[PDB]
Design an enzyme around this catalytic site. Structure first.
Site, PDB file in Angstrom:
ATOM      1  N   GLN A 150     -28.115 -25.350  45.637  1.00 47.39           N
ATOM      2  CA  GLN A 150     -28.791 -24.359  44.822  1.00 47.39           C
ATOM      3  C   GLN A 150     -28.040 -23.029  44.773  1.00 47.39           C
ATOM      4  O   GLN A 150     -27.898 -22.435  43.706  1.00 47.39           O
ATOM      5  CB  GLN A 150     -30.221 -24.156  45.321  1.00 47.39           C
ATOM      6  CG  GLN A 150     -31.099 -23.348  44.387  1.00 47.39           C
ATOM      7  CD  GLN A 150     -32.555 -23.376  44.808  1.00 47.39           C
ATOM      8  OE1 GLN A 150     -33.340 -24.182  44.309  1.00 47.39           O
ATOM      9  NE2 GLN A 150     -32.920 -22.500  45.738  1.00 47.39           N
ATOM     10  N   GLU A 192     -31.387 -15.051  39.147  1.00 54.19           N
ATOM     11  CA  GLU A 192     -31.040 -14.071  40.168  1.00 54.19           C
ATOM     12  C   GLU A 192     -29.692 -13.442  39.856  1.00 54.19           C
ATOM     13  O   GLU A 192     -29.073 -12.804  40.710  1.00 54.19           O
ATOM     14  CB  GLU A 192     -30.982 -14.749  41.534  1.00 54.19           C
ATOM     15  CG  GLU A 192     -32.175 -15.638  41.824  1.00 54.19           C
ATOM     16  CD  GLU A 192     -32.123 -16.235  43.215  1.00 54.19           C
ATOM     17  OE1 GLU A 192     -33.167 -16.729  43.690  1.00 54.19           O
ATOM     18  OE2 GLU A 192     -31.037 -16.206  43.834  1.00 54.19           O
ATOM     19  N   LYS A 316     -40.113 -14.129  53.367  1.00 54.75           N
ATOM     20  CA  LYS A 316     -40.638 -13.839  52.036  1.00 54.75           C
ATOM     21  C   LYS A 316     -42.076 -13.332  52.127  1.00 54.75           C
ATOM     22  O   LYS A 316     -42.998 -14.106  52.390  1.00 54.75           O
ATOM     23  CB  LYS A 316     -40.589 -15.092  51.158  1.00 54.75           C
ATOM     24  CG  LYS A 316     -39.184 -15.535  50.775  1.00 54.75           C
ATOM     25  CD  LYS A 316     -39.200 -16.884  50.076  1.00 54.75           C
ATOM     26  CE  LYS A 316     -37.830 -17.219  49.501  1.00 54.75           C
ATOM     27  NZ  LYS A 316     -37.760 -18.627  49.012  1.00 54.75           N
ATOM     28  N   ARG A 345     -37.584 -13.090  45.705  1.00 44.15           N
ATOM     29  CA  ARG A 345     -38.033 -14.322  45.063  1.00 44.15           C
ATOM     30  C   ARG A 345     -37.337 -14.469  43.706  1.00 44.15           C
ATOM     31  O   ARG A 345     -36.765 -13.511  43.186  1.00 44.15           O
ATOM     32  CB  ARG A 345     -39.546 -14.288  44.836  1.00 44.15           C
ATOM     33  CG  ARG A 345     -40.355 -14.290  46.106  1.00 44.15           C
ATOM     34  CD  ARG A 345     -40.162 -15.602  46.859  1.00 44.15           C
ATOM     35  NE  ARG A 345     -41.432 -16.049  47.406  1.00 44.15           N
ATOM     36  CZ  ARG A 345     -41.957 -17.254  47.230  1.00 44.15           C
ATOM     37  NH1 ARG A 345     -41.315 -18.185  46.535  1.00 44.15           N
ATOM     38  NH2 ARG A 345     -43.128 -17.529  47.777  1.00 44.15           N
ATOM     39  N   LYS A 367     -31.355 -11.056  51.577  1.00 47.06           N
ATOM     40  CA  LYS A 367     -30.971 -11.895  50.453  1.00 47.06           C
ATOM     41  C   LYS A 367     -31.716 -11.402  49.228  1.00 47.06           C
ATOM     42  O   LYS A 367     -32.923 -11.603  49.100  1.00 47.06           O
ATOM     43  CB  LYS A 367     -31.293 -13.368  50.723  1.00 47.06           C
ATOM     44  CG  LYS A 367     -30.772 -14.312  49.643  1.00 47.06           C
ATOM     45  CD  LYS A 367     -30.912 -15.777  50.039  1.00 47.06           C
ATOM     46  CE  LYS A 367     -32.255 -16.355  49.627  1.00 47.06           C
ATOM     47  NZ  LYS A 367     -32.201 -17.849  49.540  1.00 47.06           N
TER      48      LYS A 367
HETATM   49 MG   LIG Z   1     -34.449 -21.179  49.263  1.00 39.59          MG
END
Ligand SMILES: [Mg+2]
Ligand SMILES: [Mg+2]
Lengths: 404, 418
Positions: A150, A192, A316, A345, A367
Site C-alpha cells: 500500500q 495522501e 490514530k 487518516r 505519519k
Molecule cells: Mg495502514
C-alpha cells in the site's frame, strides 16, 4: 473559573470530498476551541441517506453533538479531559461508540482540549505536554509511492532539524517526479499525495533509491525507507499465494536488500501466530509497526505486548474515539519500549492536531502523508511553526526515534 | 488605538511542495494576524525566489523572508494596521519598482494580508466583516470547480462545473461533491485514470478536448442534476500557453484567432458553457476584440493572464472592449489595496469578478472572506479534493452559517453578461 457554555458542530467536507464534522466548544470566559474529525475500530456515524452525498452525510452525528452530547457537558470544566471523555463514553453506552458516533465524540474531545488550551493562552502542544514536556520534533514517514503493498515511504532520519527533514523529503519527491515523467510513467497523486505507477512491488523501492541519490542524499544515513504492507487486505497472502512464513521470508529479504527501517502490517490482523515469528525474527532488525492489528486500542495493544507482537504502534485518534483513550495507548506503548507513530487518516482535514500531539507526547514519529496536498502539508507547516517556537527544547528525534 | 509592534515571516511549504512564506503581524494590543502566500504555475508582479540550486531546487524564499523581517518591518513599525492603503503605499514606495521585483511581491503581499488580519482580530471581527464593513452587503459566491485538468493529452487547462442553480452555498458544495464522486466512479469503472492534478481534478487521457465536457455532462446526470439549469460548465482555455506566432496549437493543428473563436463558439452552442477564461492569448488583443464582439452577450469572457489583476491593464481592456470579467489573483498584483482597486474598477464597469486561488495554495482561506466581503459573487478555488482547495469551501460554509440570511447565494445573479 471558565466552564463550557456551548458546543456546536456543523457538517464540512474532508480532503476526499466526503462529509465530516467540525466542532466548536465555547467557554464562559468567551474563549473557545475548534476541531475537525478525519475519516475493528470505533464506529463513525454516517447518515446513510443515499440521496445525499451518496449516503456519507454526517447530519445525525452533528445532531448528537449539538443535542445529547452538548446537554451532558454544559457547565463542565474543560480542563477535566478524562472526566469529560468519561461522561461521553458513558453517555454513548456502547463499547463501539456506535450510538453517538466515534466522530461525534472525538470532535468534542479534541475541541474541549483546544478550548482549555486557548483559555490559558497556550498552544495545544504546550497545554498537553506540560511546561514541562519533554518535547521533541517527530521523524516523519512520507508516503511517496502507492499500491500495479500500500505505501512505499521515505524517512529523513539523518536530518539535523525538522525543517531540514522536510526539505530532504521535498527534494526527493521532486527528483522522483522528474524520473516518472522521463520514463513516461504516471505522475498524478492519490488521496495522501503520492504517485501510483509498475511491474512488481520491488521496482518501487528502486525508483525511490534512485530519487534519493539523484538529490544527493545517502540512502544509508540521510534517508531510509519504510513500508505499509497492509497485509490484512491480502489474507489463508495474495502475486502468487504465500503462506505466513513465505511472507515473512520476503520481508526478511527486502530488509536485507534495502535500507528499510520500518514495516507496517507485514502480516494480517487475523494472523497473530504469524506476527509472533515475524516479531521474533526481526524485532531487533527493523521497526515492526502494528496498525490494523491494534487499532489504537489499549486493551488490544496490551495483549499484543504480552504475546510478543510487533514493536511499534500506529496511533490514530479516531480509531479509538477520545483524547484520553488515545493518550492511554501512547502511554502504554512508551511504558513498554514500543515505538509510537502518530498517524493521519486517508480522509483528512485542515486540522493539525496530530502535529501538536506528536510533539506534546514526545512520540518521536509521525505519519502524515506525501509532500503535496495541504491536507498533508498543513501538518508539516504546523510542525515548522512548533519547532521554531520551541527551538532548542524540541530537538529533532532523529535516530533516537527508533528504540528497536 | 493599537499600532504595529512586530512583523515576522518564515518559510513554509505550499501544496505543491515548493517553499512560500507565512507572515505574522503583531500589534501593541498583543492582537496579531497571520497570512500565507500562494504561487502560480507575463506582466504579473515578481515573486522573489532564492535561486540557490542546492536548496529546494532554487525555489527557497529566505530572501523574501529577510525582506519582511528587516526593511519592511522597519518601515511599518508604529503604523495603524487599519490604514491599509497607507501601509500598502509605504511598501510599494519602499520597493520602488513597478514590478515589486526588489522586495518581492510575495513578501509584500504576505505583509499586506497579515496586516488586514491583525486589524480584524484586534476588532474581534472575522475578515469578511472587517473588509466588508458592518452592513456589507454580503453574498455567497458561485464556485467554479475544476473537475478535469489539462494543458497529458488535453489542450485546455481547466474543465469546470458551476452549480448556479443551488439555493445556498452549502447546497452548491454538495452538488459539486456529488458530481465529483459520480465522475470518479465512471472513470474507475472504465479503467480510466483516477489520480488527480494540482487543483484536485482528474487528468484522464481522452480522444479529444470535448470528451472532457461529455464525461462531465454524464457525471452531472448520474448525480441526477440538470445540465444547463442546476449546473453549467466553464472553461479555462489558458490559450496564452497554446499561442506561437501567430496561431494556436489546438487539436494537433494550428488555428487562426478566428478559427479558435469559431471553436469556442461551437462549444458555447453545443454545451451549457457559461464562462470562458483566456479564450485567446494575452498577446492577441486584436483577437480578444473580435471574441468579445461575438460572444459578450452570450457567455462570460474572463480575462486572467491578459489583465493580471492590474487596474491599469483592465482599464485599457475596458477602453478597447476586451472581455466582460476578470479573474482576481491577489499575488498577481501584490497588495490587498491594489487588488481592491481592480475589483472596484471591474464592478464600476459591469465586469464579472472571480476571486481566484493559485496552483500552489496553502491552508490560508483569505480568498473565501475576500469573495464574500466584496460581494464578488464568483470564486474559483479548485476541485473538491485536496484541503488546499476544500479548506476554502469549508471556510465559505462557516461564513454562510454565520450570516445565515444576510449572505444570499448569488446564483444566476452572479452573471451579468446579459
Ligand atoms: Mg495502514
Ligand atoms: Mg487561468
Amino acid at each position: 473559573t471558565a466552564t463550557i457554555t456551548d458546543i456546536n458542530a456543523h457538517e464540512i467536507l474532508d480532503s476526499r470530498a466526503n462529509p465530516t464534522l467540525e466542532v466548536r466548544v465555547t467557554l464562559s470566559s468567551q474563549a473557545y476551541g475548534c476541531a475537525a474529525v478525519p475519516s475493528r475500530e470505533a464506529v463513525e456515524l454516517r447518515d446513510n441517506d443515499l440521496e445525499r452525498y451518496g449516503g456519507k452525510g454526517v447530519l445525525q452525528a452533528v445532531e448528537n453533538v449539538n443535542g445529547p452530547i452538548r446537554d451532558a457537558l454544559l457547565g463542565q470544566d474543560p480542563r477535566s479531559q478524562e472526566e469529560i471523555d468519561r461522561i461521553m463514553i458513558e453517555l454513548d453506552g456502547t463499547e463501539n461508540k456506535a450510538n453517538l458516533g466515534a466522530n461525534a465524540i472525538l470532535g468534542v474531545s479534541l475541541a474541549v482540549a483546544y478550548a482549555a488550551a486557548n483559555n490559558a493562552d497556550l498552544p495545544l502542544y504546550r497545554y498537553l505536554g506540560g511546561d514541562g514536556g519533554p518535547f521533541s520534533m517527530p521523524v516523519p514517514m512520507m508516503n511517496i509511492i502507492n499500491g500495479n503493498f500500500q505505501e512505499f515511504m521515505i524517512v529523513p532520519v539523518g536530518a539535523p532539524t525538522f525543517a531540514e527533514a522536510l526539505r530532504y523529503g521535498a527534494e526527493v519527491f521532486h527528483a522522483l517526479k522528474k524520473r516518472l515523467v522521463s520514463r513516461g510513467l504516471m505522475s498524478a497523486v492519490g488521496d495522501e499525495g503520492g504517485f501510483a505507477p509498475l511491474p512488481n512491488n520491488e521496482a518501487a523501492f528502486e525508483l525511490i533509491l534512485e530519487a534519493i541519490e539523484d538529490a544527493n542524499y545517502v540512502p544509508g544515513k540521510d534517508i531510509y525507507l519504510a513500508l505499509d504492507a497492509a497485509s490484512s487486505e491480502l489474507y489463508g497472502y495474495d502475486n502468487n499465494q504465500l503462506t505466513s512464513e513465505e511472507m515473512i521470508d520476503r520481508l526478511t529479504e527486502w530488509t536485507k536488500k534495502y535500507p528499510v527501517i520500518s514495516i507496517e502490517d507485514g502480516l494480517s490482523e487475523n494472523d497473530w501466530a504469524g506476527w509472533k515469528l515475524l516479531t521474533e525474527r526481526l524485532e531487533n532488525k527493523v521497526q515492526l509497526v502494528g496498525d490494523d492489528i491494534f487499532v489504537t486500542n489499549p486493551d488490544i495493544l496490551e495483549k499484543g505486548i504480552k504475546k510478543n507482537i510487533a514493536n511499534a504502534i500506529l496511533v490514530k485518534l479516531n480509531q479509538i474515539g477520545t483524547l484520553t483513550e488515545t493518550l492511554a495507548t501512547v502511554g502504554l506503548a512508551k511504558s513498554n519500549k514500543y515505538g509510537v507513530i502518530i498517524s493521519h487518516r486517508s480522509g483528512e482535514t485542515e486540522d493539525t492536531t496530530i502535529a501538536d500531539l506528536a510533539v506534546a507526547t514526545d512520540a518521536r514519529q509521525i505519519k502524515t502523508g506525501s509532500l503535496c496536498r495541504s491536507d498533508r502539508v498543513a501538518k508539516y507547516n504546523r510542525l515548522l511553526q512548533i519547532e521554531r517556537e520551541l527551538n532548542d527544547q524540541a530537538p529533532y528525534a532523529g535516530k533516537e526515534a527508533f528504540l528497536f
